[PDB]
Structure formats: structure tokens, C-alpha cells
Design a protein around this ligand. Structure first.
Ligand code: MG
Lengths: 185, 185
């Protein structure tokens, strides 16, 4: 049950459509709400298979316009271009790090984990991702595994759209359990 | 100064258009020729700014069909999705590794240097790239700097489309010289 819980979805242009819409649908189905947070105001271009433009999604706030205390969790959807744009923006990376340091549950799927590497979160973390992130994540000090869904220290990761059924269940469990500060000391 | 020199261009779907077409035109203007090498037959999808689909370009050869001795050099264009796709294919990474190990000049622009990380070439290399690759290239053991065009061990790197004029000028003088297996020992 996510009644009264609000989840931040951090995403730029290039986000994999299904990796935004399907977990968002799980969060609302569990009774929670989500808000789409981004670099610039307006809309964000979603993709299918990284390069086929699909629908556009309205951004609720720019990253500098929100605080960590407004949210009970963080979702980092993939699509190759999206996290690659996010990792270059200081306010974006500060928000991801701050979310973590405040004990808030974090879910990243597919290319999404790139933000966990940029912020240093990956270091000593058990996690998965899309196969192309294996190198950077292992170099970054991660305990990288190839599994459909991995949870460590309130951080949920998955590899791909087909992991969504298992990811959606796990993200809801973790968003519901709440503050993981004590597991991150 | 490239008459009789043939340059292999390795690119997948998601290739930044100008990073394919501009260096190719500079090679052809120099008297040289190029061939587009890829993962699958037919065409690849080029993009503008990573996410706006532009023109499709015809593939000449699949990567698991061509020989190193066939070429005098290697171009690795960027666009985010393309090297991310390229780096998961063993055939494609073995081909960029054999080109290096035989001493042939290599040029990589923007996200293109990802293949140089996957393949171990980035270790001990002075190089640049699009800014988002800084973290991985650093952890891979590269000497990463923020510069217009870097050449080391006959590997030419540049950051972005703005760097095209300098990149293009450098690659023509590097493809002209050839055989750097003495510098990579
Ligand atoms: Mg937990």
C-alpha cells in the first residue's frame, strides 16, 4: 500500500516509454502517486527500443524546483539517451544522491542505473542493469549480477522491459517499507 | 592525402548523422574511400541530437564478414545509442581490437570512444570524448582531458560536432601516416 506516498520519476528526453509508464502504473495501482521530474520544463520525448520516438510526457517540475522531503521514493527509468543526459546535470545528480543519503528507496531499470554510478551510489552495491552498463558499474565498485530483480540497501534494479513484472512488485514492497537510512549507514 | 586508403566505419542504429557523414566527406575529399561496417545487413538509422530519426544509410558489410587487412583505418562515430549497441557484440569489439593491435589509425568522436573502453584500448590512453563518458573512461584507466581533438598512439578522439573541423583535419593526417603498432608496444 502506497496511499499517501509520492514517488519522483527522474527522466530526460530519450526515456524508454514502457519503463516510465509500467512502473508508474504499478505505483498508482498500489495507491501511490508519481510526479515526473526533469531537466527542463514542458515535455519529454519517450522512445521505443531507444530510437523510435513515441509519446511525449509532461514534466511536473524541473529538478531545481523540488526538494527530497516531498518524496517517499525515486524511480530512474532507462532508455539509453535519458540517463546519459541526466548524468551531466549537477542538480539532477545532487537530487539522486540526496534521495539516497536521506534513506529514500530507489528503483532504477535498464540504462537507469547510470545515475547510481555517477553519484557514487553503485560502490559496494549489489545490483543489476542492462548488459552494456556492466563494465562501468563493475569498475565503479558494484557487486554486479545478471538477475531480473535485485534489491540491496533499499535500491531496486532490473535489466530490461521483460523484468517489469518482477521489478514492479519489488519497487512497491520497497516504497512501502520506507526509510532505509539504517541499512545505508 | 588519402588516395588508395580505405577507411572502415563501424556504426549501428542510433548513429549521430553528422558524425558519420562529415568525416566520411573529409576522407573522400582527401582522395580516400570508406565502407560502412555494422551488426546486421541493410541500413542503419541515423539520428539528429540522439533522438530525432534522420536518414537511413546502407550497410556495406556485416562485422563478422570483413578483414582487418582490408582497411587502412577505422572511424568510430558517436550518437548515444550506437556505441551502446556496438559494445555488446563480440564480433564488433574483436574487430576494433584487431584494428588496434595491427597498428591501424583509429578515430572516435563523441560517444564513439565507448568501444575503446569495452575493448581495453582506453587503458593508458590520452584521450577525450563527449563529457558523459568521462567517468567510465577514467575508471578504465584513460588519461581523460576536455579538449577539441586529442591524438595518442594514433588514436584520434574528439568530443562533439563542434570539433568536426579539427577532428576531420587530424584524421586525414593520421590516416595518411599509418602503422602505430610501434607506439602501442
Ligand atoms: Mg528493503
Amino acid at each position: 500500500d502506497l496511499t499517501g506516498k509520492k514517488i519522483a520519476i527522474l527522466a530526460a528526453d530519450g526515456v524508454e516509454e514502457i519503463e516510465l509508464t509500467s512502473p508508474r502504473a504499478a505505483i498508482e495501482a498500489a495507491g501511490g502517486t508519481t510526479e515526473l521530474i526533469s531537466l527542463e520544463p514542458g515535455e519529454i520525448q519517450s522512445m521505443k527500443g531507444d530510437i523510435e520516438p513515441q509519446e511525449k510526457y509532461r514534466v511536473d517540475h524541473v529538478v531545481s524546483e523540488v526538494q527530497v522531503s516531498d518524496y517517499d521514493g525515486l524511480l530512474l527509468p532507462g532508455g539509453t539517451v535519458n540517463p546519459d543526459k541526466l548524468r551531466l546535470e549537477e542538480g539532477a545528480m545532487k537530487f539522486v544522491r540526496d534521495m539516497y543519503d536521506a534513506g529514500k528507496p530507489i528503483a532504477a531499470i535498464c540504462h537507469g542505473p547510470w545515475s547510481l554510478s555517477e553519484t557514487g551510489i553503485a560502490q559496494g552495491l549489489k545490483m543489476t542493469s542492462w548488459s552494456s552498463l556492466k563494465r562501468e558499474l563493475t569498475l565503479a565498485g558494484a557487486q554486479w549480477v545478471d538477475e531480473e530483480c535485485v534489491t540491496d540497501k533499499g535500491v531496486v534494479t532490473s535489466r530490461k522491459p521483460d523484468d517489469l513484472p518482477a521489478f514492479n512488485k519489488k519497487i512497491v514492497e520497497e516504497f512501502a517499507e520506507g526509510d532505509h537510512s539504517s541499512r545505508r549507514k
